[PDB]
Amino acid sequence: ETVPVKLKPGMDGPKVKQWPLTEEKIKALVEICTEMEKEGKISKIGPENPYNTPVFAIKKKDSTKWRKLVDFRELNKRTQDFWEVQLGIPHPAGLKKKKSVTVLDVGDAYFSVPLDEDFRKYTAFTIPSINNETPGIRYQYNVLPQGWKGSPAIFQSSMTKILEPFKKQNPDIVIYQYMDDLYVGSDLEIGQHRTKIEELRQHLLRWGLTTPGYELHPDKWTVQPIVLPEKDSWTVNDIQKLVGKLNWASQIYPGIKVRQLSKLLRGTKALTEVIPLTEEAELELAENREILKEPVHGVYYDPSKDLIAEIQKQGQGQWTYQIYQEPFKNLKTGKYARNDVKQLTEAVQKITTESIVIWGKTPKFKLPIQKETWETWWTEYWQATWIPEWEFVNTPPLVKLWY
Amino acid sequence: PIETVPVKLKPGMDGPKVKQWPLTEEKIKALVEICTEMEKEGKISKIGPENPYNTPVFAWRKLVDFRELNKRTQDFWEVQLGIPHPAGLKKKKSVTVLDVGDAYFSVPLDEDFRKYTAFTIPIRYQYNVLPQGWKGSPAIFQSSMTKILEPFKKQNPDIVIYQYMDDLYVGSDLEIGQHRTKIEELRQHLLRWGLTTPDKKHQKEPPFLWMGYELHPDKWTVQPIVLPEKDSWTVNDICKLVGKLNWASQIYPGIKVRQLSKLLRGTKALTEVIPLTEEAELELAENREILKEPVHGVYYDPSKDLIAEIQKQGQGQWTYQIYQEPFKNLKTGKYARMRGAHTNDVKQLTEAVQKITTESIVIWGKTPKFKLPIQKETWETWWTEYWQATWIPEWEFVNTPPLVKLWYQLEKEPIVGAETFYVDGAANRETKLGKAGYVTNKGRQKVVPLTNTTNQKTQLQAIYLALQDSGLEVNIVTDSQYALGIIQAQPDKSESELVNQIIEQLIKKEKVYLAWVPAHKGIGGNEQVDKLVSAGIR
RNA sequence: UGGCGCCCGAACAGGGACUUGA
Ligand SMILES: CCCCCCCCO[C@@H]1O[C@H](CO)[C@@H](O)[C@H](O)[C@H]1O
Ligand SMILES: [Mg+2]
């Protein structure tokens, strides 16, 4: 039998409007949805279904075939209770300590489990049409949809049975699926890790489960600490830029002081005037430098609170990001190095993958991009089977001074 | 024989009970005759005792009102929020338009939901078909007609059918005779489901006066836009004019609407005569000259490539033409939106490009090739030096006079041998007056009293004062993140006169370095200028 | 009486930058 699913009390299913899609994406969606309907995975619905979740088409990594990407973010929010409390998937704290972490895709196995009859209504999506020529094609899921956070919650009972022989045969390999992927971490040589991943793929194929950003190395992940300029000659402009940077950083590191550095900017001086740092000023600068290299002390992950990711466009293809739950409490600060939209999409996907590997939870992204440009072009470079919750903000001019 | 859509009331709710409107003497006879006619047609049935509901009906036709029932019924998901654009229609050799007589009345209504549509007159009738004006009638009719057309659409891939509210746009690349045969086949198929359509000598020929457009066999346009040539202009007249020439802007190029819309700022009465500004009069004359000659659009050709060319016409105004062959453009348009209080030409061009991209994807499902009046070097500089993830798709430079460029750039490092200006501004919230001033490493000072000003305005005034009082090269040090961000955005035009003065003075300056220092940290000259402008405010 | 496109106005919420007082 199916697993009954109920939305949060007093809350109604998603009614998110479908973003316009291109002709090729619409054709790909039409063909794949016709195939799915023939296979019974989805069914056509009438107008009596007020719920809708936007559906996009993407091309997965190293693949030319199109893939459907239903944006179940609203449905995920509305099933939060169900899929987090009563069928939650524990996150292994040792996945981030593994030399290699490969990311398999196992969402095709969800289509073997029927969806709750009373919940299929909310898993409703529309394929748009060009120029509103014809009404959008409305579909509805008859099986556990990909991208819904309750699909892994319902399928984990089967997944544990599938993986039990594998895990017993080698208990040193950490497996963890978040929504549709299967993060497999091990401390083996990349050749041996690939061999064991092939063995796991054969194991999944034996148990019916199918499987085709992909290989991760959380062992070689380091934070991007704040670095002060290292100059032999200091100008008034340089010293006051340093003082501003340290004053901002003091909101993060209580031990940062600017007293002796600010004591150098005593009078009204030219920005190009060269000021030789005093003994006290040099010592305090050294102390600030030593305080800054180490990570902040007292910042701990709170599973109750949502993760927030801020990204700054540093220019020249370089991006800096910070992951935090409270302001000035960065859990992780890093840098992404390579088209601004493509680079931002790649940065967002990498940051989300790191967040999944570390805390098993995607963050909320404050994207330094105009909202229309992102909603227009993000699907042109997206390759993940999941979609993180994002908002669009205007990066302060002085916050781009993370490097 | 059309399969009905299962509909139900909202959870924990029952059909409305609304008394009849005040009409029982004159329109009563017409309503009774209409009800009897519908009952004979079978679309209306009589149920008196077992239908404890009612709706407010008021007529001649019978415009039954379902305002209460609309909010008592489970919501639907309408998809045709917009309307098809003629530019998006495919150029078909032969086109026929079929109107569906009695569109809703041919679609039955759910048996369980029939009672809730009680129809009582001073008798108790109930709808057997989709009621007019009901919230669920449009979606249900659209779904039923899609289901009906699916067997025909699949069996006739060549025939393209666009369904509007009650109109069938049937296009085919077949010869006139074959197209007529297919149209008769479609009419018979619809009649098999009870949807009656006109015959050969009942069909409407082109042009098709549809939704403000004039659809011709091989071109499209709008109905003639006869603007009112009057002397006085009320806010109602200005709104009507703006709407009329906004409709024309999609085909007529060069249409400007900024001064006319600006005339609608602060207006309260719908009849207040407006003193049409000289700029507004000139813009209206330009629009009249544009509208003097007819302009027609062409239909979409998927075999050709979709080109979009944008032109800058000043005052933050952009016009674009989307075409596939030169001098024959599918549709035109304008982008005059001012996103944010401050902007420059490059950001506005990026916003216009994004708007055109979304518009084209909506109409044609594909982004167009962009022909922009901006040099590749200018765009490279902007988007490399800009803090946003701005990006425009494949575009080509067009050497038109009004080229898009950046009128000034801020130095990345302090200017050697220039003068440093430490600018600050303090505003008294209570009195609303403040001060702005500057101090210089050379030893100069100046404080200019302000009035009816805020802290941000005082900071901007201080920066403007420093720019005025400095040579061609100036280092300006400010403690205001607000002004720093505004200036670093490199705006070209602004909604604030002070910011426009700052912009023009920056354009005058050959080199301008703008530094930021935290306030109240005792940083050299910042504290001095704060003490200067803090006497009357702090 | 309802939807769509545009414009004005208001209240909400939040995402930020500042002034003063306690
Ligand atoms: C684009 C999808 C709909 C196109 C067909 C619209 C119906 C045809 O247009 C019709 O033209 C007539 C005069 O010719 C007018 O009297 C009607 O009001 C109008 O509906
Ligand atoms: Mg100040």
Author numbering:
A (entry chain B): 6 to 217, 231 to 356, 363 to 427
B (entry chain A): 4 to 62, 71 to 133, 142 to 557
What does the paper say about this structure?
A packaged viral enzyme, reverse transcriptase (RT), initiates DNA synthesis at the 3′-end of a host tRNALys3 that is part of a binary complex preassembled with the 5′-end of the HIV-1 viral RNA, called the primer-binding site (PBS). Kinetic investigations have shown that reverse transcription initiation on this vRNA–tRNALys3 template–primer complex is slow (~500-fold slower than elongation), nonprocessive, and displays a distinct pausing pattern along with the viral genomic RNA (vRNA) template.
Using a minimal, active RNA initiation complex that spans the portions of vRNA and tRNA that reside within the RT cleft, while eliminating dynamic peripheral RNA elements that do not interact with the protein, we solved the structure of the minimal RT–vRNA–tRNALys3 initiation complex (miniRTIC) to 2.8-Å resolution, allowing for de novo modeling and definition of RT–RNA contacts. The miniRTIC, despite displaying activity in vitro, is captured in an inactive state unsuitable for nucleotide incorporation, as previously observed in lower-resolution studies of the initiation complex. The tRNA 3′ primer terminus is displaced ~5 Å from the canonical elongation primer site (P-site), away from the catalytic triad (D110, D185, and D186), and resides in the P′-site. This displacement is accompanied by an ~3-Å shift of the primer grip toward the thumb and away from the polymerase-active-site residues. In addition, the p66 thumb opens by ~6 Å and adopts a hyperextended conformation reminiscent of RT–DNA–NNRTI structures as reported in past analyses of lower-resolution RTIC structures. The tip of the fingers also hyperextends by ~5 Å to facilitate binding to the wide A-form vRNA–tRNA template–primer complex. The majority of protein–RNA contacts within the RTIC are located in two distinct regions that are one turn apart along the minor groove of the PBS helix.
